[PDB]
Design a protein around this ligand. Structure first.
Ligand code: VYJ
Ligand code: VYJ
Length: 112
């Protein structure tokens, strides 16, 4: 699928890179460390943990056949943050800014 491969390349080379270099992205660059953060319930409440490194590795290993599968993982990462945390939390403020950037860059993904 040439079109799907081109869209996945855009997600890897543009969207992922733009989120990664954003100054708020660091908490999302590795899976949540429930021990370090003292969150003994995180991996019970969050049923599909997700982070930018997991997405990066999936792109690198050709894990996705379609762009929608990769977009789903970005959406899960943000959704998880909002499910576990509370309005007004530092991480929720960071996530909202990152998600705005995500939507902007995603809207420029080639459509055909
Ligand atoms: C592997 C390292 O990991 C962490 C380290 C540190 C840390 O002290 N360093 C790191 C940043 C350093 N600077 C800051 C930027 N500077 C411009 C350059 C260098 C200085 C000190 C803090 C949190 C970490 N890890 C985490 N990973 C997921 C989450 C997460 N923290 N946050 C916090 C991130 C900050 C707001 C809250 C959560 C906390 C509680 C519950 C959930 C979540 C949550 O949802 N996420 C996604
Ligand atoms: C912030 C802007 O907002 C969007 C706008 C437009 C748009 O109108 N055009 C038409 C005009 C195009 N220009 C404008 C400048 N110029 C002068 C030349 C013409 C730009 C694109 C499309 C998607 C948007 N924003 C979005 N935000 C989250 C999602 C999202 N689209 N997609 C789509 C983006 C990639 C494929 C699907 C979703 C769609 C349905 C269900 C879920 C999701 C989903 O998961 N996400 C995360």
């Amino acid at each position: 699928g040439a079109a799907s491969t081109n869209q996945l390349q855009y997600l890897q080379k543009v969207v992922l890179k733009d989120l990664w270099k954003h100054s708020f992205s660091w908490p999302f660059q590795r899976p949540v460390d429930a021990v370090k953060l003292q969150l003994p319930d995180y991996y019970t409440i969050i049923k599909n943990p997700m982070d930018l490194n997991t997405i990066k590795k999936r792109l690198e290993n050709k894990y996705y056949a379609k762009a929608s599968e990769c977009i789903e993982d970005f959406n899960t990462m943000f959704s998880n943050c909002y499910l576990y945390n509370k309005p007004g939390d530092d991480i929720v403020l960071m996530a909202q800014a990152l998600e705005k950037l995500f939507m902007q860059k995603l809207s420029q993904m080639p459509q055909e």
